[PDB]
Amino acid sequence: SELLVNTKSGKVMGTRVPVLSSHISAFLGIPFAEPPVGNMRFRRPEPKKPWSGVWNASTYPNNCQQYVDEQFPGFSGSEMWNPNREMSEDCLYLNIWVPSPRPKSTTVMVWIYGGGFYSGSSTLDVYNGKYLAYTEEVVLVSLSYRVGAFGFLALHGSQEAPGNVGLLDQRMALQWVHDNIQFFGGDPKTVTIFGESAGGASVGMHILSPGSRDLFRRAILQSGSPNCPWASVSVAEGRRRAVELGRNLNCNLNSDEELIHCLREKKPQELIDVEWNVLPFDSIFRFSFVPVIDGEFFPTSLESMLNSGNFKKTQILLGVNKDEGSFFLLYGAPGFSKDSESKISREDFMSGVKLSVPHANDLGLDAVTLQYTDWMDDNNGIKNRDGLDDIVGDHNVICPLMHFVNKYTKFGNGTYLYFFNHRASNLVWPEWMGVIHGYEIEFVFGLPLVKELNYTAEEEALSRRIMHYWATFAKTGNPNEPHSQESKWPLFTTKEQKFIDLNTEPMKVHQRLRVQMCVFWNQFLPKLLNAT
Amino acid sequence: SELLVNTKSGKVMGTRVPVLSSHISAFLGIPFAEPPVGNMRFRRPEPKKPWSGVWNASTYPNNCQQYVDEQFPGFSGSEMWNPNREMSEDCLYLNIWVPSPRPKSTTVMVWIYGGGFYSGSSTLDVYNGKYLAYTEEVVLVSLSYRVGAFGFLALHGSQEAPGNVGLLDQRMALQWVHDNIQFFGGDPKTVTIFGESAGGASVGMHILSPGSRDLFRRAILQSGSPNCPWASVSVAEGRRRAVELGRNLNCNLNSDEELIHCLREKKPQELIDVEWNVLPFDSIFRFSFVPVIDGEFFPTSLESMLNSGNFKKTQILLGVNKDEGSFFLLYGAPGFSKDSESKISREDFMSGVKLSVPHANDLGLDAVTLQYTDWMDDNNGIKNRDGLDDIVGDHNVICPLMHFVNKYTKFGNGTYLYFFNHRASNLVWPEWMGVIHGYEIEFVFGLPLVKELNYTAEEEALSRRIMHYWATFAKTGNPNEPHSQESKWPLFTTKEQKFIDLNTEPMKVHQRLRVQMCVFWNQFLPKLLNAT
Ligand SMILES: *[C@@H]1O[C@H](CO)[C@@H](O[C@@H]2O[C@H](CO)[C@@H](O[C@@H]3O[C@H](CO)[C@@H](O)[C@H](O[C@H]4O[C@H](CO)[C@@H](O)[C@H](O)[C@@H]4O)[C@@H]3O)[C@H](O)[C@H]2NC(C)=O)[C@H](O)[C@H]1NC(C)=O
Ligand SMILES: *[C@@H]1O[C@H](CO)[C@@H](O[C@@H]2O[C@H](CO)[C@@H](O[C@@H]3O[C@H](CO)[C@@H](O)[C@H](O[C@H]4O[C@H](CO)[C@@H](O)[C@H](O)[C@@H]4O)[C@@H]3O)[C@H](O)[C@H]2NC(C)=O)[C@H](O)[C@H]1NC(C)=O
Ligand SMILES: *[C@@H]1O[C@H](CO)[C@@H](O[C@@H]2O[C@H](CO)[C@@H](O[C@@H]3O[C@H](CO)[C@@H](O)[C@H](O[C@H]4O[C@H](CO)[C@@H](O)[C@H](O)[C@@H]4O)[C@@H]3O)[C@H](O)[C@H]2NC(C)=O)[C@H](O)[C@H]1NC(C)=O
Ligand SMILES: *[C@@H]1O[C@H](CO)[C@@H](O[C@@H]2O[C@H](CO)[C@@H](O[C@@H]3O[C@H](CO)[C@@H](O)[C@H](O[C@H]4O[C@H](CO)[C@@H](O)[C@H](O)[C@@H]4O)[C@@H]3O)[C@H](O)[C@H]2NC(C)=O)[C@H](O)[C@H]1NC(C)=O
Ligand SMILES: COc1cc2c(cc1OC)C(=O)/C(=C/C1CCN(Cc3ccccc3)CC1)C2
Ligand SMILES: COc1cc2c(cc1OC)C(=O)/C(=C/C1CCN(Cc3ccccc3)CC1)C2
Ligand SMILES: *[C@@H]1O[C@H](CO[C@@H]2O[C@@H](C)[C@@H](O)[C@@H](O)[C@@H]2O)[C@@H](O)[C@H](O)[C@H]1NC(C)=O
Ligand SMILES: *[C@@H]1O[C@H](CO[C@@H]2O[C@@H](C)[C@@H](O)[C@@H](O)[C@@H]2O)[C@@H](O)[C@H](O)[C@H]1NC(C)=O
Secondary structure (H helix, E strand, O other), rough: OOOEEOOOOOOOOOEEEEEOOEEEEEEEEEEEEEEOOOOHOOOOOOOOOOOOOEOOOOOOOOOOOOOOOOOOOOOOOHOOOOOOEOOOOOOOOEEEOOOOOOOOOOOOEEOOOOOOOOOOOOOOOOOOOOOHHHOOOEEEEEEOOOOOOHHHOOEEOOOOOOOOHHHHHHHHHHHHHHHHHHOOOEEEEEEEEEEHHHHHHHHHHHHHOOHHHHHHHHHHHHEOOOOOOOHHOEHHHHHHHHHHHHHHHOOOOOOHHHHHHHHHHHHHHHHHHHHHHHOOOOOOOOOOOEEOOOOOOOOOOHHHHHHHHHOOOOEEEEEEEEEEEEEHHHHHOOOOOOOOOOOOOHHHHHHHHHOOOOOOHHHHHHHHHHHOOOOOOOOOHHHHHHHHHHHHHHHHHHHHHHHHHHHHHEEEEEEEEEEEOOOOOOOOOOHHHEOOOOOOHHHHHOOOHOHHHHHOHHHHHHHHHHHHHHHHHHHOOOOOOOOOOOOOOOOOOOOOOEEEEEEEOOEEEEEEEOOHHHHHHHHHHHHHHOOO | OOOOEEEEEEEOOOOOEEEEOOOEEEEEEEEOOOOOOHHHEEEEEHHHHHOOOOOEEEOOEOOOOOOOOOOOOOHHHHHOOOOOOOOOOOOOOOEEEEEEOOOOEEEEEEOOOOOOOOOOOOOOHHOHHHHHHHHHOOEEEEEOOOOOOOHOOOOEOOOOOOOOOOHHHHHHHHHHHHHHHHHHEEEEEEEEEEEEEHHHHHHHHHHHHHOOHHHEEEEEEOOOOOOOOOOEEEEEHHHHHHHHHHHHHOOOOOOHHHHHHHHHHHOOOHHHHHHHOOOOOOOOOOOOOEEHHHHOOOOOOOOHHHHHHHOOOOOEEEEOOOOHHHHHHHHHOOOOOOOOOOOOOHHHHHHHHHHHHHHHHHHHHHHHHHHOOOOOOOOHHHHHHHHHHHHHHHHHHHHHHHHHHHHHHHHHHOOOEEOOOOOOOOOOOHHHHHOOOOHHHOOOOOOOOOOOOOHHHHHHHHHHHHHHHHHHHHHOOOOOOOOOOOOOOOEOOOOEEEEEEOOOOOOOOEOOOOOHHHHHHHHHHHHHHHHO
C-alpha cells in the first residue's frame, strides 16, 4: 500500500490527506530518537530502537515542553505560534508529506522551526507541508528538537548536560532522513534544509558543524544566521546560566552532578517558570538557553570558522523581512503596544536603545543613537518608533545575516539573497509592526493558495512564485528555471552583492542590502566596544 | 577743511577718493600704536605718542611681516590675499573711510582681517571700504594687527613675549576708534566690529575678553568663531612651539630671556622661513602662532566662558559659506589641485581624513570616515572629494560656529544666522572648490557694484542687499528695515534655530544648520576621543 513504508527502524503507516482538491500521503509523528526523559533529560539524544509492528503515523506528535505565550489570549496572531498539541518531554518526532503517487527519487526539503531556541513546534498550521509537497512535487519533512533548558542547558565538561543537545536532536533527524527518506520516494542526495529565525541560525550551524555537513546537500536560511548575537553563548556564560537556573530552584550547586541531579527531579513547568530569570542583562531579543560555542559541535569561534572557510561549501538561498525588530519591541520594550500606534518619546527611545544593545557601554549607546536619529526632527514619535524597529532588526537579524552572507560567498558555490517586504493583507498585528518577523513563512508554505484564509490573488501568485523558487533551488541549486521567460534572480557575488525584493510587484534587483547600517554594526561598533 | 581732522593724538590729513561716480574722504595709514620694533618685538603694543603737525594720511600703510603665497604666481585668485604694500614690522595703522559731507554721528563698522593669524593686510583691494561707506552712509574703519610669531609667539609667564599681542593690537585700535571716531563723524556708541575667518574668531574673542567688551556695541562674525580648533592653543603648546621655533634658528633655549633675545636679533624673514616647522602634527587648517588661552585676555577656558555667560551680551549677526574646506584641501592635502577636478581615491580620502583631524586616534578616524562615506558608492571620486571638503569645513568652521551660536544665544540679545551659498560668476578658482572660504567678502564690501569687475546684475543686487543688511544691523541691532515690504530675516532663537540662505534667489528660511554633522563634531566625537 501507498501508506505503508518499511524503513530501517520499522514499518510505518501514514494517512491520505486532502490538499487543494487533490490528496497526498502524510506520515506524522515518526520517532527518530529515544524519548529524552528521566535520566536522559539534558543528554545527547539516542537513536530510536527499531520496532516490530506498524507504527501508527496518522496523527501529529506531542510538542516539546516550552514557554507558552499568554500575552493576547485567544488572539490568532500570537496563538498561531504556540503549541497546538499536548506538550511532553517525549517529543522527538518528525513529519513527512509525500506526493501521490509515491515518487521514486524526488527533491527533499527538511524544515527546522524557529522560536528563539526556547519554543517552537513542527505541528503548527503555518508549517503544514502539504501545500508545498503537493504543488512542487517535493517530499517535505519537518523535524523537532528540544528547546529551552531541555535542549540547551550547558555545563561544559559534563557528559550529562554537555549543551547543544537540541542541535544534536536536529542532526539525528537529518541522519534519519539521510538513511530512510529513499523508502518514501525522496532522494537522499538532494536534501535541502530550511528554517526561519532560530531555525535559520540552526541551518547555518549545520553548515558550520563538521559533524552535520555531510547529511544534506544545500540550505535556505530565513531571517536567521548562525552568528546572530542571540543565537549562541560561550561555555562560561552557559555554565553561569545553568547555575543561576539551579539557584532559582534551590538546587545544590556544589558540582555538575549535584546540579543536574537536582534539575532532573523538577517537573518540566518548574524550569520553564524561571527560565527567563537567568539572563544577565535587561534586554530584548535575548533568550536564556541557546547553542554553546563548545569546541565540539563548533570546533572554534564562529568568526574564525567563517574567515577560514571551515564550513560546508554548497549553494545557499537566504534573506530577511523588512521589519524584523517589531515583534521583540512589542513584547519587550516600554511604549510599544499591540492596539496603539506606539509613538515613542525620546525617553522610551533611549531606554529602547539600551535594551537593544545590552552589552554596550555609554559611548556605544551614543553611537547607536547617533546612527539612527534624525537630528532635524528628533521628537518625531513615528521616527523614534521606526528607528528602534530598525535598530532591533539590524543588530539582531539583518546585519548578522549580511556578514554571514559576505563571508560565506567567498568560499561557497552559489548564493541567492532576498529582501521580503510584502505585508500580508490579512495580517492581524497592527500596522506599525510592518513586515513582521515570521510572516514570510506563510508564503513559503503556500497558505495563500487556500481561499478561506482570505489572501488576495496577488498574494497567491507571490506565494506560488516563492514556493517554486524555494523548490527549484532545492532541486538544482538555482531558484530560476534554466530557460524561463520569467525575470531572473541573479546570483549574489562578492563584487556586486546583488539581491531581489520579494513582493507582489515586478522583480527588482538591487545591491548592497542595508550596507550603511551594516558597516556600523559589523565593523565600527565592535571596534568601538573593543577599544573602551 | 573736510580732509583735516584733529584727534587726541594729533591732526591728520586725508584725501578725497572717487567711488561710483561720487567721492568720499579717506584717511589711510593712521598710526594707533608705537611701531613694535627692536626690543618691542613680541611685546604688548604701546599707544602711539601724540604728534605735532599734520600726519599725512593720503596713502596706505605698510603690511605686517608675513608669509607670502607663491604657489600660483601671477594668479589673481591667490594674489588678491597677499600683501599689496611693502612689509614692515612698522605696521600698526588703521584706515578710515568717511562719507562726504562729513557726518555728525553715524554708525561705525570696524573690519578685522583674516588670514589664519599668520597673514593678512588691511590694504587689500577686496577690503576697500569706500563702497560700503558711500552706499550705506557708515564710517568704515579697517585696522591692522601683528600676525605670525610677531603677533602670537607665546612664552607665558614672561612679559617680554606674553602671547596674544596681536589681539592687544586689535584692541588698541578699537580703543583709538572709541576715543577718536567722533572727530570723523562716527558715533562711538554704535561701533560694530566685523571680520572673516581669523578675523571672525578675533571678533568673538573680543566678545569674550573682559578687557575688550566695553569698546564696541555689536558684532558680525563671518566664517570664524573663537572656539575654532585652529584659533587658539594652550599655554603649554604655545611655549612648546616657541621653543621649537628657537630650535629651528639655533637659539639658546635655556631661558625665556635667552630665547627671546635670540629671536629678536633675527630678521623678520628668518622667522617666517621656519614658522611652519613647529606644528606638532601633519595637518591641514592648522597655523603655528595663534591666540593662547592665558588666564588674562581669556580668564578661563573658552568653553567655561561660553557655558557660564562670561561674555558681552549684545546682538550678533554671523554665518558660514557652503564650501569652507576647499581652500585648505587645495593647499594642504594630496590629490587636490587647482587645474584638475581633483577626484580623490579611497587612499587619498583616508589620508585626507587623517590630515583633517590630527588629534584623532584610529577609532576617531574610523568615526569620521563612517560619518561621511556613502557605502553604496564608496569609490566615487567626486563623493570622496566633496566628502573631504565637508569634513574640513564642518570640523574647522561650521560646527564650531554652530556651537558658538547656540551657546551665545542663551544669554545674548539677538542673533541673526546666514548660510552664504552663491558662487561668484567670475570666480577664477576651479568649480570643484564651490563657494569658497572668503568669497562672500567681495559681496560685503560691494565689489559687484563696480562694472569693470564683471559680476552679473543679480550679483550686484545680492551685494546691495548684503551691505544693507550688514549696515542696518550695525545701526540698529537688526538687519531688517523696521517697516519694509521686503522678506524678513528672522531671529535665530534657541528653540527654533532659524537661518537664511544668502544667494540670488528669493530668501528662504530654514532651521538647524548642518545639525546632523554638528552633533557628530560637537558632541559625539569629543566624547569618543575622551573615552579612549
Ligand atoms: C560551483 O562549482 C562548480 C563545480 O566545481 C563550478 O564549475 C566549474 O567552473 C569552472 C569555470 O570557472 C570550470 O573550469 C573550466 O573547465 C574547462 C574544461 O573542463 C577548462 O578548459 C577551463 O580552463 C579554461 O578557462 C579558464 C577560465 O576559468 C582559464 O583559467 C584556462 O586557462 C582555460 O582557458 C576551466 O578550468 C570547472 O570545470 C567547472 N566544473 C564543472 C563541473 O562545471 C561552478 O562555477 C561553481 N559555481 C559558482 C557560482 O561558484
Ligand atoms: C476571513 O474573513 C471573514 C470575513 O470577514 C472572517 O469571518 C469573520 O470572522 C469572525 C470570527 O471570529 C466573526 O466574528 C464573530 O461573529 C459572531 C456573530 O456575529 C460573534 O458572536 C463573535 O463574537 C464573539 O467573539 C468576539 C471576538 O472573538 C467577542 O469579542 C464577543 O464577546 C463574542 O465572544 C465574533 O465577533 C465574523 O462574524 C466574521 N465576519 C463575517 C462578515 O463573516 C473569517 O474569520 C476570515 N477567515 C479566517 C480564516 O481568518
Ligand atoms: C534685548 O534686550 C531688551 C532690553 O533689555 C529686551 O527688551 C525687554 O523685553 C521685555 C519683554 O520680554 C520687557 O519687559 C516687559 O516690560 C513691561 C513694561 O515695561 C512689563 O509690564 C512686562 O511685564 C508683563 O509682561 C511679562 C511678559 O514678559 C510678564 O512676565 C508680566 O507678568 C507682565 O504681564 C515686562 O517685564 C522689557 O522692559 C524690555 N525692555 C525694553 C527697553 O524694551 C529685548 O527683548 C531683548 N531682545 C532679545 C532678542 O532678547
Ligand atoms: C573682465 O572680463 C574681460 C573680458 O573677458 C577681461 O579681459 C580679458 O583679460 C585678460 C587680461 O589678462 C586678457 O588676456 C591677455 O590678452 C593679451 C592680448 O591678446 C595677451 O598678450 C595676454 O597674454 C599674456 O599673459 C598671459 C596670461 O597672463 C600669458 O599666458 C601670455 O604668455 C602673455 O604673457 C593675455 O592673454 C584678455 O585679452 C581680455 N579679454 C577680452 C575679451 O578683452 C577682464 O580682465 C575682466 N576684468 C577683470 C577686472 O577681471
Ligand atoms: C517571557 O519573556 C519574554 C517573551 C518574549 C520576549 C521577551 C521576553 O522577555 C525578555 C520576546 O522578545 C518575544 C518575542 C516574540 C518572538 C516572535 N514570536 C512568534 C514567532 C515564533 C517563531 C518564528 C517567528 C515568529 C512571538 C514572541 C517573546
Ligand atoms: C606654507 O604652508 C601652508 C600654507 C597654507 C596652508 C597650509 C600650509 O602648510 C600646512 C593652508 O591651508 C593655506 C590655505 C589658504 C587659506 C585661504 N587663503 C586666502 C584667504 C585669506 C584670508 C581670508 C580668506 C581667504 C589662501 C591660503 C595656506
Ligand atoms: C491510528 O490512529 C488513528 C487516530 O488515532 C487517534 O489517536 C490515537 C493515539 C488513539 O488514541 C486513537 O483511538 C485516536 O483515534 C485511528 O482512528 C486509527 O484507528 C489508528 N489505526 C490503527 C491501525 O491503529
Ligand atoms: C602726502 O602724500 C602724498 C603721496 O605721498 C607719497 O608717499 C609719500 C611717503 C612720499 O614719498 C610722497 O612724495 C609720495 O608722493 C603726496 O603727493 C603729497 O604731496 C603729500 N602731502 C603733503 C602735504 O605732504
